[PDB]
Design a protein around this ligand. Structure first.
Ligand code: NA
Length: 282
DNA sequence: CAGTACT
DNA sequence: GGCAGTACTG
């Protein structure tokens, strides 16, 4: 990632959702598959593919159809309406991603679900109440969500299709991600999930250089690299994260939180000039 | 875990 | 020698 026959096949096959270099090489080696179209053709007869991979394959065409800005507006409205219906006024939905950066086309619908600033406090992480699952099930019963790639208490990834509009128009299925985020974490999650990816990396490096940890959950003042390392020793998890569980920082990391109300707060604390979403494509 | 995904 | 950071799958 830093530097950035069998190789060319890997380059082909990793276009498919669920397939990385490892699954690709196994397709090549075990199955003798060189191209996407061979994989599409053989998929059903390779018993070892995951359910998620089978979704990536079955929806290959849809996934690679870009979403026009105007359809994203409809997805946003729809998600907000359904959120209001089944979750009520305590909850809100915001669509981020390249759409919020105002690109004419996007590759998916990237949503944040969170409690409003006015909602009563909870005594538990919001992801422990099972609200993401309730919301997902609601959207499935409506046939908006029609296939799941992966779902946990914090994050849903799947396929969503707007219902037909009346001549009648049938919509394409679209990649939909939904993340359940604590209220105080909204501005940092908006930053993260609006991106771009390179933008986030640059800002996280700026945070590191000033002795902060920046992630979607918050901005945390760590101090020296050694104080940071000492902290990571205590609560940091090798292949997982710096110390959150169910979207809530562990106490010792929470103690380091610098509260923010807005994206602007984060730029300011890091000594960076504000950039509007549409100017976050470095 | 190791793979894969996401911004 | 470490790098941006974190979620779900099996
Ligand atoms: Na892929």
């Amino acid at each position: 990632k830093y530097k950035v026959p069998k190789l060319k096949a890997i380059q082909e096959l990793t276009q498919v959702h669920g397939f990385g270099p490892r699954a690709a090489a196994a397709l090549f080696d075990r199955e003798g598959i060189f191209t996407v179209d061979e994989l599409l053709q053989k998929a059903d007869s390779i018993p070892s593919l995951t359910d998620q991979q089978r979704v990536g394959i079955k929806y290959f065409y849809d996934i690679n159809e870009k979403i026009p800005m105007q359809e994203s507006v409809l997805h946003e409205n729809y998600l907000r309406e359904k959120c209001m219906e089944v979750l009520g006024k305590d909850f809100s939905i915001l669509i981020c991603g390249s759409y919020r950066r105002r690109h004419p086309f996007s590759g998916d619908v990237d949503a944040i679900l969170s409690r409003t600033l006015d909602a009563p406090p909870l005594s538990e992480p919001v992801a422990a109440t099972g609200v993401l699952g309730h919301f997902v099930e609601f959207l499935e019963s409506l046939k908006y969500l029609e296939a799941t790639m992966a779902q946990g208490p914090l994050k849903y990834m799947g396929m969503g299709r707007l219902p037909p509009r009346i001549n009648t128009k049938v919509y394409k299925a679209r990649r939909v991600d939904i993340r359940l985020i604590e209220t105080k974490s909204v501005p940092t999650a908006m930053l993260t999930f609006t991106g771009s990816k390179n933008f986030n990396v640059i800002m996280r490096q700026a945070a590191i250089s000033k002795g902060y940890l920046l992630n979607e959950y918050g901005l945390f003042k760590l101090g020296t690299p050694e104080e940071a390392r000492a902290l990571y020793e205590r609560i940091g998890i090798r292949g997982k994260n710096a110390g959150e569980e169910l979207g809530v920082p562990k106490d010792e990391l929470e103690d380091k939180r610098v509260e923010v109300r807005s994206e602007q707060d984060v730029f300011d604390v890091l000594g960076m000039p504000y950039a509007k979403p549409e100017n976050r494509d470095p």
